[PDB]
Each structure stands twice: as C-alpha cells, then as structure tokens.
Amino acid sequence: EAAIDVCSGDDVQLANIDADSKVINVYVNKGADLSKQKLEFTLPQGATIKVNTPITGDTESTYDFSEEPHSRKFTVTSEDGQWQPVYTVNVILAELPTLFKFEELLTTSSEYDTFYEFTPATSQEISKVLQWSSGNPGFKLTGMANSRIDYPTVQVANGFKGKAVKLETRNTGDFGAMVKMYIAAGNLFIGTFEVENALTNPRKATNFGFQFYKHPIALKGYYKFKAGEVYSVEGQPQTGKRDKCDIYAVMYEAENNSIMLNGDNVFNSDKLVLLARIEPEDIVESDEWNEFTIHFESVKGREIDDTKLQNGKYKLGIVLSSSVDGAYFRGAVGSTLYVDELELICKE
Amino acid sequence: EAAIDVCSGDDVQLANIDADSKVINVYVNKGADLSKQKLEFTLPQGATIKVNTPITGDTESTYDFSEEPHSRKFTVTSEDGQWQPVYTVNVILAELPTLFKFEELLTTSSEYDTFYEFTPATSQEISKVLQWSSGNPGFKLTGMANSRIDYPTVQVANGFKGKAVKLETRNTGDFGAMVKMYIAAGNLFIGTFEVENALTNPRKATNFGFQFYKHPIALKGYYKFKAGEVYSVEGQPQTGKRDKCDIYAVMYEAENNSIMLNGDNVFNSDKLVLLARIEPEDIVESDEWNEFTIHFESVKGREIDDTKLQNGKYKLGIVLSSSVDGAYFRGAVGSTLYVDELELICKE
Ligand SMILES: [Cl-]
Ligand SMILES: [Cl-]
C-alpha cells in the first residue's frame, strides 16, 4: 500500500532508508546546492508522495533543505488511500573519501553490483561517502548477463584486504557488433553514468568528477591484471598486441558545479589541471597482488589555486578500466583487472 | 698496540667494525666508484696500516674494490712492532632509505649525536643505508656544549614510534656574535658537512644530496614544533615575528658525481628539478605530534629523465631545520622541532 522503496537524486551519493523508524538519511557531496535538491522517490504502484510543509524555497522540481537541520517530513499515501506513513528525510553533507576499499554494495541494486564507500563523521571530520559508477547499467541493455557475476564490474570476495573490485572486458554479442560496440570494458569511476547515452554515445555516458577540497599528490593501491587472449579492433581479432588495463585520476576546474568531463574530453579539455596515470610499461601480469603509486602531475604547467579549491571550483575523478582503449572498442575480451585498497595521498 | 678504531671515507655511509672477527663492513651508496675508494683509518698511536695485496687499480690515495667480492685484506702493525692483526674490509652497495626512523646512533660519535638509518638487504632489495649529517661538528667548535644534550641536533627517547630527532636553535655565545654567527639552528640533512668551512663559510659547509634512483612524489612524516621566545636578527632582538621551522627535500641533476648543492645555492641552482617544502602557513605549535605530507613539485617545468635517473644523474636531499632562516642567523634561540618517521613516497 504505502512506503518509500528507493530514494535517489542528482546530488545523492547514498540514501539509507530505515524502514523501522521511517527515516531517510541522504548523504550529498559538500558543494551541493541544499536550497535546490532534486530527489526521486520509488513508491509502491499507485501510491503518491507529498512534502508536509511546503516552503517558499521550493520549486516545482526541487526542494529547499538549506535551513538547518536540513530535515523535511514527507507523507506517502496509498492508492488504496488508507495508509499514510510519514517519513523524515535528513540531508547530510559528506566529502569524497581518502581510502577506497570496495567492501560495500548498494542493497537496492540486485541485478548488478553498485559499490559505495562510507566512513562515519567524527568530531574531526565529516562523513566520507561515494557511490562509485560503472558501465553496468549500459551492459544490462545488451541482454548478455544472466546475473550480477556476468557483468564487466563485479565485487569479489578474496580481495587484498576484505573484498575487491573485479573489472572484466566482456563480449557484447551480435547486436553489439551491429552498432559497433564490439566489447565492454569493465570500469569503475567517480562521477555519473547517463544511461540514455549508453548506446548512442557511450563516451558521453561516462561523466567524471565530484567537488574535491584537498590537493591530491598521489594515488596508491593494489592490483592484479591478466590480459585476455584475443585482442580485437572493430570486432576483428588482431595479433601482435597484448591488452593493458588502466588506472588514472584527474583534478579539473569546474567554473560552475554543472560542468563535468566525460569519455570524449577527459584527456583533451583545457580544464584539466592535474593527471595521475599508470604507465603501460609498469603494468605486470601476475597472480600476486602488486602495489602501485602514481603521481598527480601538472598538465601544461597548470596549478591548483587554493582560494578556488576552497570555493569548490575543482573536481576530482578516479577511473579504473580492464582495457585501456576499451572505450574505443580496442581490447581483449577476458582482460581482468582486480583493484583493492586505493589511497589518495594529499597535501597535509 | 694494533687495531682499527674507526674507518671512514668519502663515499662511506656506514662502517661496521667487528673487533672479534676483525671484519670491517663498509656500506657505500650505489653509484660510488668502487675502483677509486678513498678510505680513512683511525689506528692506535704509532701503529701503521698497509693493504696486503696491492693491485694495479690502486693509486696513492685510493683503493680499487671494483672486482667482486669487493673485499681486501689489510694488516695493522703496532709501533711496538710485535702485533700485526689482519682485517678484512668488505665494501657493500646500498641505496638511500624510504623510511627514516631516527632510532640509531653511531657508537663512535660520543661527544655529539650522529644518526644513521639501516635496513638489511633481502632477496628483493639491497641494503638501505644513510648516515645523516648535521651542524654538530661546527657547533662543537663554539665551546658552548657540555655534552651531547647541549647540541642543536640530538636524539630523544620519546619519539612518535621509538626514538626521534630534536632540533633546537642554540645560542653561540660572544665569539659567535663577534664573527656574526649569532645563532645555531638545529639541522639534519642528507649530504656532507665540511667542517673546515664551519666558521668561515657556514652555508658552504652544508652540502646536500646523494645519488637516488627512484622518482620521488612526496615526503610524509610527524613533527612537533615550538618557537623560541626571542626572535633575533644579526644578534639583536626583534618583536613582531615568530620563528618557524623548515622541512624540505630536493632532487637535482648532478652531471658528474662530485657535484653537490649547498646552503648558498640550493634554492637558486638551475640543476634543481624537484622541490618539496612545508608551507610556513601549515606549521602549527602543538604538544601533540602532527602528520605532514609535502609534494615534490617541478621547478621551472623541469622533469626527471628516466635514463638519466637510471644512470645516477640525480641526487636527492632532505633537510630539516629548527629555524627556517637560521642559516642566515635569523631565528629564535629555543625554537625546537621534533621529527619522526619520515617516509619518502615514490613512483611505483
Ligand atoms: Cl544501501
Ligand atoms: Cl656504529
């Protein structure tokens, strides 16, 4: 009859729904406009939802949560018409994490894995939260997967410390071949996946970056990589080249908060300030985990302006991929990159 | 009558003398010319020393240890003339460390502390060794110290993990004032101290850097700092300025292995490639240990050439000081900087 099954939103990294107390805790990245929050509620069929006290700051597509304690009540009325449970929605500010462990999955996402990072706030610092994105919602559309384990991006149990992320380049079948999307690289990235572009503009579907308030120096982690056996270009097998995985991170200037880089301009936009990237020559294929440390280097002499950093003008992105040229459909089905325990080393 | 009490040398980071077996293990930094080793032996009064088998590679002031196992025998004959113990001298290649813990002191240096770092070799890597330098041999000349604890550079027991280094700016007395060397900053650095310049050219006395074969990204550590009460310039008290400590590291190109930077050109030489340095604004005065992380930044767009790095053309230096402008005699007697557990984060 009436309830809130899922809560999403433009700036929502994570939304915890406590069905017992009817409390929804929504974590958003610092910098989000609290006065203009766009939220999306998934309710049972025929049920309606309405904010209890509308306020002037509200618009027809957003809610104003700017006033402390950034908490608003909502009533869900059944189609049935008889049940009207009241939910409290609390918006909580968070920052991107420093450590990424790949231990947690969204319990709402059952068809494929969706990873998130979370560290509770303390007296010293606010909540550290991130919902990682991938190409999984696009891969779903291929009809190729049977369950979560067939996807290009999957959580595995025997990580370096706890669980880890497994990225595997997958075969997209005949239809994939027809639309020239011959392979599906496994990826994990900070930003958003626009599924309405997944097939029409796969590189535009991957948007990278969230507001970051620290100065990054290095990205450190552990990985294992094994290349697939058959390297292909435009769907056809090629000899003489072995596939390689990819790990990189970016810091770029976003004049206004709506600006994001994507798969088509991440390495060519003049907004890019810092870039850390694993050297192809340094990648090994081993059954043992290897530690890597990469350096956030200045792009064309650009540097981080502290005042701009403080005002949220820079966005950080981290991208992991099983096939370095996979976004262009060059790579080998079966290339598998496992990553675990990433650490962002920042100026301190 | 006859023995080897101390063994030193131009390229000798550390020399262990095992009096029981009469074995001297000399660790030198990778890059040293094994065919031209200059060694200095301290023997009892009147005793003489001579290499057992001279070889063609020998010169009148150096020894050739290039041939494996880089081991030569030496006989020490007493003035007494009756005792001739034979010592075996083994030269061992080492690299600069990654971790600096300030736990060990040279047992030969009793008047003032001389710190060294040591990690034994393994199947994976060679010995990691460094003898740290300081201004202590110069301070000795002031007559101001009673024992090791009065020096500007001293090991203290209650470090962050084990023992730590305590750098304290000291008063140089009336003679110091006469020669315009009004204060003595406590320092610790990678390189060499030329005591014959200690008074005549104190900045030239501090030579920085040893051959380093990795790409440094960041220097990380723990510190506590407390400024002295009276800030002075040219021996005279000044109000309106509080003293600050300093921590920095450099990577510079050395065309030939004899090139070193010093106190007069470390921040102006065109050989400088990378510089990491703590921001004055980021230093706090606290009774609690604080972690710092500084970034090796490109100087004037310069970058590390891998082939040159591999051939030992770059030297790394790390410098710690209780008074940032202490080399120019601006600072406060009593400024105290404790450092512990430094870690060099490198590309991997
Ligand atoms: Cl969840
Ligand atoms: Cl010793």
PDB file of C-alpha atoms in Angstrom, chain B residues 72-204:
ATOM      1  CA  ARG B  72      90.521  -6.615   0.541  1.00  0.00           C
ATOM      2  CA  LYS B  73      92.715  -7.584   3.493  1.00  0.00           C
ATOM      3  CA  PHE B  74      94.768  -5.045   5.498  1.00  0.00           C
ATOM      4  CA  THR B  75      97.467  -5.553   8.144  1.00  0.00           C
ATOM      5  CA  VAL B  76      97.815  -3.233  11.158  1.00  0.00           C
ATOM      6  CA  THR B  77     101.306  -3.335  12.649  1.00  0.00           C
ATOM      7  CA  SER B  78     101.946  -1.892  16.116  1.00  0.00           C
ATOM      8  CA  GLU B  79     104.612   0.805  16.665  1.00  0.00           C
ATOM      9  CA  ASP B  80     105.505  -1.662  19.411  1.00  0.00           C
ATOM     10  CA  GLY B  81     106.220  -3.749  16.210  1.00  0.00           C
ATOM     11  CA  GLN B  82     105.095  -7.041  17.706  1.00  0.00           C
ATOM     12  CA  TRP B  83     101.355  -7.220  16.808  1.00  0.00           C
ATOM     13  CA  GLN B  84     100.047  -7.469  13.254  1.00  0.00           C
ATOM     14  CA  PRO B  85      96.336  -8.270  13.200  1.00  0.00           C
ATOM     15  CA  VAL B  86      94.775  -8.710   9.780  1.00  0.00           C
ATOM     16  CA  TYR B  87      91.458  -7.087   8.957  1.00  0.00           C
ATOM     17  CA  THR B  88      89.143  -7.874   6.059  1.00  0.00           C
ATOM     18  CA  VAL B  89      87.347  -4.845   4.604  1.00  0.00           C
ATOM     19  CA  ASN B  90      84.162  -5.609   2.627  1.00  0.00           C
ATOM     20  CA  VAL B  91      82.555  -2.847   0.576  1.00  0.00           C
ATOM     21  CA  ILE B  92      78.773  -3.278   0.240  1.00  0.00           C
ATOM     22  CA  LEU B  93      76.495  -1.292  -2.103  1.00  0.00           C
ATOM     23  CA  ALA B  94      73.442   0.356  -0.579  1.00  0.00           C
ATOM     24  CA  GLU B  95      70.691   2.772  -1.595  1.00  0.00           C
ATOM     25  CA  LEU B  96      69.116   5.612   0.316  1.00  0.00           C
ATOM     26  CA  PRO B  97      66.239   4.550   2.528  1.00  0.00           C
ATOM     27  CA  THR B  98      62.467   5.090   2.007  1.00  0.00           C
ATOM     28  CA  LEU B  99      61.753   5.189   5.789  1.00  0.00           C
ATOM     29  CA  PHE B 100      63.730   7.309   8.271  1.00  0.00           C
ATOM     30  CA  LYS B 101      63.120   6.452  11.944  1.00  0.00           C
ATOM     31  CA  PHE B 102      65.942   8.224  13.776  1.00  0.00           C
ATOM     32  CA  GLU B 103      66.485   5.137  16.031  1.00  0.00           C
ATOM     33  CA  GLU B 104      70.222   4.594  15.637  1.00  0.00           C
ATOM     34  CA  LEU B 105      73.330   6.499  16.592  1.00  0.00           C
ATOM     35  CA  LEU B 106      76.944   5.930  15.568  1.00  0.00           C
ATOM     36  CA  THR B 107      78.647   4.381  18.541  1.00  0.00           C
ATOM     37  CA  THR B 108      81.957   6.078  17.582  1.00  0.00           C
ATOM     38  CA  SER B 109      80.491   9.621  17.961  1.00  0.00           C
ATOM     39  CA  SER B 110      80.148  10.195  21.801  1.00  0.00           C
ATOM     40  CA  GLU B 111      80.660  13.967  22.083  1.00  0.00           C
ATOM     41  CA  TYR B 112      77.533  14.675  19.938  1.00  0.00           C
ATOM     42  CA  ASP B 113      74.939  12.537  18.178  1.00  0.00           C
ATOM     43  CA  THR B 114      75.375  11.246  14.670  1.00  0.00           C
ATOM     44  CA  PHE B 115      72.255   9.473  13.289  1.00  0.00           C
ATOM     45  CA  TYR B 116      72.137   6.709  10.728  1.00  0.00           C
ATOM     46  CA  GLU B 117      69.429   4.576   9.052  1.00  0.00           C
ATOM     47  CA  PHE B 118      69.933   0.956   8.138  1.00  0.00           C
ATOM     48  CA  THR B 119      67.750  -1.843   6.732  1.00  0.00           C
ATOM     49  CA  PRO B 120      69.386  -5.140   5.770  1.00  0.00           C
ATOM     50  CA  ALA B 121      69.362  -6.357   2.220  1.00  0.00           C
ATOM     51  CA  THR B 122      66.903  -9.029   1.111  1.00  0.00           C
ATOM     52  CA  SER B 123      66.279 -11.191  -1.909  1.00  0.00           C
ATOM     53  CA  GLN B 124      64.112  -8.298  -3.207  1.00  0.00           C
ATOM     54  CA  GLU B 125      66.378  -5.326  -2.413  1.00  0.00           C
ATOM     55  CA  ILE B 126      69.802  -4.187  -1.388  1.00  0.00           C
ATOM     56  CA  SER B 127      70.780  -2.601   1.926  1.00  0.00           C
ATOM     57  CA  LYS B 128      69.168   0.767   2.657  1.00  0.00           C
ATOM     58  CA  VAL B 129      71.704   2.959   4.467  1.00  0.00           C
ATOM     59  CA  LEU B 130      72.244   6.614   5.292  1.00  0.00           C
ATOM     60  CA  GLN B 131      74.427   8.468   7.739  1.00  0.00           C
ATOM     61  CA  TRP B 132      72.592  11.745   8.407  1.00  0.00           C
ATOM     62  CA  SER B 133      74.645  14.954   8.638  1.00  0.00           C
ATOM     63  CA  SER B 134      74.181  17.978  10.903  1.00  0.00           C
ATOM     64  CA  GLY B 135      75.855  21.148  12.020  1.00  0.00           C
ATOM     65  CA  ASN B 136      77.069  19.441  15.272  1.00  0.00           C
ATOM     66  CA  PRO B 137      80.780  19.253  14.279  1.00  0.00           C
ATOM     67  CA  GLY B 138      80.622  23.010  13.712  1.00  0.00           C
ATOM     68  CA  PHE B 139      78.779  23.659  16.975  1.00  0.00           C
ATOM     69  CA  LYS B 140      81.429  21.707  18.846  1.00  0.00           C
ATOM     70  CA  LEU B 141      83.840  24.436  17.907  1.00  0.00           C
ATOM     71  CA  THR B 142      81.846  27.082  19.799  1.00  0.00           C
ATOM     72  CA  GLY B 143      82.825  25.668  23.179  1.00  0.00           C
ATOM     73  CA  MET B 144      79.161  26.123  24.204  1.00  0.00           C
ATOM     74  CA  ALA B 145      78.206  22.442  24.693  1.00  0.00           C
ATOM     75  CA  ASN B 146      78.902  20.380  27.849  1.00  0.00           C
ATOM     76  CA  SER B 147      77.728  17.072  26.406  1.00  0.00           C
ATOM     77  CA  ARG B 148      75.660  15.602  23.608  1.00  0.00           C
ATOM     78  CA  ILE B 149      72.435  17.068  25.052  1.00  0.00           C
ATOM     79  CA  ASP B 150      73.518  20.682  24.546  1.00  0.00           C
ATOM     80  CA  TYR B 151      73.890  20.359  20.772  1.00  0.00           C
ATOM     81  CA  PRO B 152      71.480  21.741  18.165  1.00  0.00           C
ATOM     82  CA  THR B 153      70.829  18.174  16.903  1.00  0.00           C
ATOM     83  CA  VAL B 154      70.008  15.491  19.486  1.00  0.00           C
ATOM     84  CA  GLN B 155      68.250  12.114  19.715  1.00  0.00           C
ATOM     85  CA  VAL B 156      65.451  11.974  22.260  1.00  0.00           C
ATOM     86  CA  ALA B 157      63.720   8.894  23.517  1.00  0.00           C
ATOM     87  CA  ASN B 158      60.032   9.645  23.381  1.00  0.00           C
ATOM     88  CA  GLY B 159      59.542   9.880  19.659  1.00  0.00           C
ATOM     89  CA  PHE B 160      56.340   9.149  17.714  1.00  0.00           C
ATOM     90  CA  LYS B 161      57.452   5.492  17.146  1.00  0.00           C
ATOM     91  CA  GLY B 162      60.595   4.697  19.216  1.00  0.00           C
ATOM     92  CA  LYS B 163      63.179   7.495  19.278  1.00  0.00           C
ATOM     93  CA  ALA B 164      63.132  10.834  17.428  1.00  0.00           C
ATOM     94  CA  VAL B 165      65.329  13.724  16.371  1.00  0.00           C
ATOM     95  CA  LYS B 166      65.172  17.001  18.286  1.00  0.00           C
ATOM     96  CA  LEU B 167      66.488  20.085  16.520  1.00  0.00           C
ATOM     97  CA  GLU B 168      66.948  23.158  18.698  1.00  0.00           C
ATOM     98  CA  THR B 169      68.299  26.555  17.840  1.00  0.00           C
ATOM     99  CA  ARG B 170      71.154  27.338  20.237  1.00  0.00           C
ATOM    100  CA  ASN B 171      72.994  30.407  21.456  1.00  0.00           C
ATOM    101  CA  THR B 172      76.559  30.665  20.088  1.00  0.00           C
ATOM    102  CA  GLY B 173      77.937  32.995  22.825  1.00  0.00           C
ATOM    103  CA  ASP B 174      80.130  36.092  22.490  1.00  0.00           C
ATOM    104  CA  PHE B 175      82.627  34.725  19.956  1.00  0.00           C
ATOM    105  CA  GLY B 176      79.716  33.647  17.766  1.00  0.00           C
ATOM    106  CA  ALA B 177      78.443  37.190  17.983  1.00  0.00           C
ATOM    107  CA  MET B 178      81.930  38.543  17.032  1.00  0.00           C
ATOM    108  CA  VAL B 179      82.065  36.573  13.785  1.00  0.00           C
ATOM    109  CA  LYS B 180      78.382  37.315  13.038  1.00  0.00           C
ATOM    110  CA  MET B 181      77.199  33.700  13.665  1.00  0.00           C
ATOM    111  CA  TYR B 182      74.702  34.783  16.265  1.00  0.00           C
ATOM    112  CA  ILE B 183      72.612  31.594  16.493  1.00  0.00           C
ATOM    113  CA  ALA B 184      72.946  27.915  15.592  1.00  0.00           C
ATOM    114  CA  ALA B 185      69.913  26.332  14.024  1.00  0.00           C
ATOM    115  CA  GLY B 186      69.475  22.648  14.700  1.00  0.00           C
ATOM    116  CA  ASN B 187      69.520  20.690  11.457  1.00  0.00           C
ATOM    117  CA  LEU B 188      69.608  17.262   9.941  1.00  0.00           C
ATOM    118  CA  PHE B 189      70.337  16.655   6.289  1.00  0.00           C
ATOM    119  CA  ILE B 190      71.351  14.191   3.594  1.00  0.00           C
ATOM    120  CA  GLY B 191      74.817  15.031   2.336  1.00  0.00           C
ATOM    121  CA  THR B 192      78.068  16.121   3.995  1.00  0.00           C
ATOM    122  CA  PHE B 193      79.243  18.732   6.480  1.00  0.00           C
ATOM    123  CA  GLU B 194      82.674  20.323   5.554  1.00  0.00           C
ATOM    124  CA  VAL B 195      83.948  21.323   8.996  1.00  0.00           C
ATOM    125  CA  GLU B 196      86.860  23.329   7.543  1.00  0.00           C
ATOM    126  CA  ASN B 197      84.175  25.811   6.359  1.00  0.00           C
ATOM    127  CA  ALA B 198      82.016  25.697   9.509  1.00  0.00           C
ATOM    128  CA  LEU B 199      83.057  29.180  10.625  1.00  0.00           C
ATOM    129  CA  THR B 200      84.488  30.747   7.506  1.00  0.00           C
ATOM    130  CA  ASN B 201      81.615  29.697   5.157  1.00  0.00           C
ATOM    131  CA  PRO B 202      78.843  28.050   7.153  1.00  0.00           C
ATOM    132  CA  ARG B 203      76.437  27.719   4.152  1.00  0.00           C
ATOM    133  CA  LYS B 204      79.111  26.078   2.005  1.00  0.00           C
TER     134      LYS B 204
END
